[PDB]
Amino acid sequence: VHLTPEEKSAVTALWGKVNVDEVGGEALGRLLVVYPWTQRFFESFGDLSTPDAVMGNPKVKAHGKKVLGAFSDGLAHLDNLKGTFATLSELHCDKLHVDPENFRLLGNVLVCVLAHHFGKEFTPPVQAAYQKVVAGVANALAHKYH
Amino acid sequence: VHLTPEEKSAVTALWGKVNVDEVGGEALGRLLVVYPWTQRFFESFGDLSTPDAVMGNPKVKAHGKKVLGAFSDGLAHLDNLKGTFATLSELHCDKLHVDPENFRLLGNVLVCVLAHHFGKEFTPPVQAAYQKVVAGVANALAHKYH
Amino acid sequence: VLSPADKTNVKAAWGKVGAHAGEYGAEALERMFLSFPTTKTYFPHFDLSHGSAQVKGHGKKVADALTNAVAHVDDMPNALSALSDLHAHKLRVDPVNFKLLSHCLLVTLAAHLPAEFTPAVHASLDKFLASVSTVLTSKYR
Amino acid sequence: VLSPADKTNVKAAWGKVGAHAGEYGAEALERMFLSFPTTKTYFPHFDLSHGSAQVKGHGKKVADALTNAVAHVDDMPNALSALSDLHAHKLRVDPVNFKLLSHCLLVTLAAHLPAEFTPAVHASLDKFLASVSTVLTSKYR
Ligand code: HEM
Ligand code: HEM
Ligand code: HEM
Ligand code: HEM
């Protein structure tokens, strides 16, 4: 994915201030709450029928931490997304059969979470930069799938 | 993309019987007719306001021929989709800004066109094989985009 | 919204399909489970094998709900209320799946009725199925 | 369909946004044109620059249509009939674009109202915007 110097720089800057132990569980939980069909993918997690039961579920938090981890590794290899994500693509595509539209969905929930945490600092240009990185990750995750 | 021997073989077989000068204009035209917003991308083509004006438009036919050409080249390098499609991805993503959902759309219109031409020979298993090849092409077309 | 021509096309397709409705519905379901494995997870205790009697049976239920939608173009949500609560607020069917089934339903028609599945008919049928999908995922919006 | 709690949340968000509505609408539009260039092609003769007065003005029109939808949750298609014909049967706006604007509208709220944009509110707002999008692309189905 091609980021201008100011985009590439804005992404890194904001990301350095992200609470890696929180933001991922928040994006996951929000996804599960806003698009309830995605809960089917995590029955093992337990009762996801109220937002609070979702946001505070230990497993949601723990697992979101792993997702956020995956994005970070993408922000470090923006030039080789199909790379670090070759593994996660097989788990999500060949094994789980997650429709790509759902990757888009989670990538946009992440963007709302970042907007939530940074307020006016999450300017339209900065959002624009993250939308590029997010679409990349989604597309990379959807390779060797179908 | 990973096709079983019978899928890989079914694709090749059917494809060998496809009228390359017709099928592509038909998929394009059907796309323009069924999802009318896609006409915006081809204003230069002229009045696309009736299906007949669309299906018979010389430019639609000529251009669909080029698309079908692109799919064929994909069927020949099923192992390197991101390859032959590196070029078309930049034209469609970096220049045209076509949402990927629209690639999915055209890939499924192609499948209906094949079903139309082959009748009962386009069995569920054969459709299943083409859906894999079609999703691959779409995802490859959506790389280096966003 | 379905124009007058769209209703005509949709009903004309329905009349031509005739007695084959249940069977085409079962065929669409088979195309969906095979082309898009994710959908299978929605029917765990189902015999999803080729000649499954249970898929045959489910195909007829789908076709009949479609016939009901066809009969209530302007009254669809009232018409498929229960059905909407079932898929939207209970099974939580992924909206994408509806687009996938809609597509297999069109592929099925095109495989059986090539001469009659013209671009114009294809567009009318697609509008129709998207109206049905809108309703069935309705409870979400 | 919007539950009673969803209506409450949606109206509560609307009340808190208050006088900022037009401005947040303009901000959402700016986020959309910048994050998703494809949408720009829909406003050729528009001054799409940052402080554009024309984007400011369009933002207010959008916010007002949203206010109108908020006031007609159960009467939406009648409420936004013209608007639906405009986007669906005239400009032929790609349905995807509506999801993209819906998203920028939520991003805008979350940037201004972090404390109040809770998961539950986020879900209610998303349902609401999807209901509006359903209508605006309505003429297609
Ligand atoms: C933005 C894209 C996404 C990223 C970065 C991501 C990342 C991850 C990571 C890093 C893991 C653990 C992988 C491993 O241990 O090898 C995981 C597992 C998984 N993901 Fe995702 N994911 C994404 C989207 C989704 C969505 C959209 C769903 C479906 C609604 C989903 C469903 C799952 C499931 C079911 C597992 C395994 C759950 C378990 O560990 O019990 N993922 N994901
Ligand atoms: C299944 C995916 C698709 C394939 C295989 C495909 C293939 C092609 C090919 C081979 C060309 C000419 C490229 C060149 O000369 O370098 C082309 C051009 C183009 N395509 Fe696609 N395409 C796809 C989807 C789409 C869709 C979904 C739209 C948008 C609704 C679109 C819009 C265009 C435009 C505007 C051009 C240039 C038109 C012109 O030559 O005047 N394409 N495409
Ligand atoms: C054209 C759209 C569809 C129509 C017209 C339709 C119609 C029906 C009908 C008539 C029933 C039986 C209702 C009852 O007995 O109460 C049903 C149930 C069911 N459908 Fe759908 N449906 C559609 C799409 C979907 C999709 C896309 C999925 C999933 C990929 C889905 C999942 C199910 C499930 C899981 C059941 C319950 C099966 C059982 O356990 O008995 N439906 N559908
Ligand atoms: C939340 C959804 C939306 C609402 C509430 C909304 C509302 C409006 C309103 C109130 C108007 C002015 C109507 C008039 O003067 O007759 C308008 C016009 C317009 N909108 Fe939307 N709209 C939405 C989404 C979209 C999207 C997604 C696009 C394109 C990416 C779009 C494209 C346009 C265009 C091209 C115009 C005409 C601009 C002009 O030339 O004057 N709208 N919209």
Q: Where are the domains of chain C?
A: 1-141
Integer angstrom CA distances of residue C11 from B34, C61, C63, C129: 18, 18, 13, 13
Contact of A97 with chain B, judged by CB distance below 8 Å, is answered with no
Give chain C's largest Cα–Cα span. Answer: 42
Give the one of A30, A51, A116 whose C-beta lies nearest to D114's C-beta. A116
Task: Answer yes or no: are the C-beta atoms of B110 and B127 closer than 8 Å.
Answer: no
Task: Answer yes or no: are the C-beta atoms of C124 and C9 closer than 8 Å.
Answer: yes
Q: Which residues contact D45 (CB under 8 A, 6 or more apart)?
A: none
- What is d(CA C114, CA C130) in angstroms, rounded to the nearest whole number? 21
Q: Note whether C127 contacts D140, CB cutoff 8 Å.
A: yes
Looking at chain C, list the stretches that DSSP marks H as alpha helix, in order from N- to C-terminal side: 4-17, 21-35, 53-71, 76-79, 81-88, 95-112, 119-136
SS (H, E, C) chain D: CCCHHHHHHHHHHHHHHHHHHHHHHHHHHHHHHHHCHHHHHHCCCCCCCCCCHHHHHHHHHHHHHHHHHHHCCCCHHHHCHHHHHHHHCCCCCCHHHHHHHHHHHHHHHHHHCCCCCCHHHHHHHHHHHHHHHHHHCHHHC
- What is d(CA B116, CA B100) in angstroms, rounded to the nearest whole number? 24
Q: Find out whether D58 is annotated in a ligand binding site.
A: yes
Element (H, E) at C45: none
A65: phi > 0 → left, psi -120 to 50 → alpha, else beta; which? alpha
- What is d(CA B112, CA C103) in angstroms, rounded to the nearest whole number? 8
- What is d(CA B98, CA D36) in angstroms, rounded to the nearest whole number? 10
Q: What is the resolution of this structure in A?
A: 2.1
Task: Answer yes or no: are the C-beta atoms of B31 and B109 closer than 8 Å.
Answer: yes
Which of B103, B139, B141 to substitute to test the interface with A, most A CBs within 10 Å? Answer: B139
Count of Cβ atoms closer than 10 Å to residue A101 Cβ: 18
Tokens matching residue B91: 């034209």
Q: Find out whether C50 is annotated in a ligand binding site.
A: no
Contact of A142 with chain B, judged by CB distance below 8 Å, is answered with yes
Nearest ligand atom owner, CA of C28: 3
Integer angstrom CA distances of residue A132 from A6, A111, C73, C121: 13, 11, 41, 38
- What is d(CA B27, CA C110) in angstroms, rounded to the nearest whole number? 13
Listed by number, the residues of chain D in 17-36 with a beta carbon closer than 8 Å to a beta carbon of chain A are 27, 30-31, 34-36
Which residue lies with its CA nearest to atom 32 of ligand 4? D42
Tokens matching residue C14: 């329905």
Q: Which residues contact C106 (CB under 8 A, 6 or more apart)?
A: B112, C117, C122, C125, C126, C129
HSE of D55, CA atoms in CB hemisphere, 13 A: 20
Domains defined for chain B, CATH in brackets: 1-146 (1.10.490.10)
Shortest distance, CA A115 to any CA of chain B (angstroms): 20
Structural gaps in chain D: residues followed by a C–N separation over 2.5 Å: none
Tokens matching residue A68: 């956020």
Nearest one of D96, B143, C57, D114 to A113, comparing CA atoms = D114
- What is d(CA B61, CA D76) in angstroms, rounded to the nearest whole number? 41
Task: Answer yes or no: are the C-beta atoms of B85 and B67 closer than 8 Å.
Answer: no
Tell me: domain D1-141, CATH 3.40.50.720, correct?
no
- Taking contacts as CB-CB distances below 8 angstroms, the residues of chain D near B39 are 92
- What is d(CA C4, CA C8) in angstroms, rounded to the nearest whole number? 6
Question: Which chain C residue lies closest to A36 (C-alpha atoms)?
Answer: C92
Method: X-ray
- What is d(CA B143, CA D42) in angstroms, rounded to the nearest whole number? 24
DSSP letter at D73 equals T
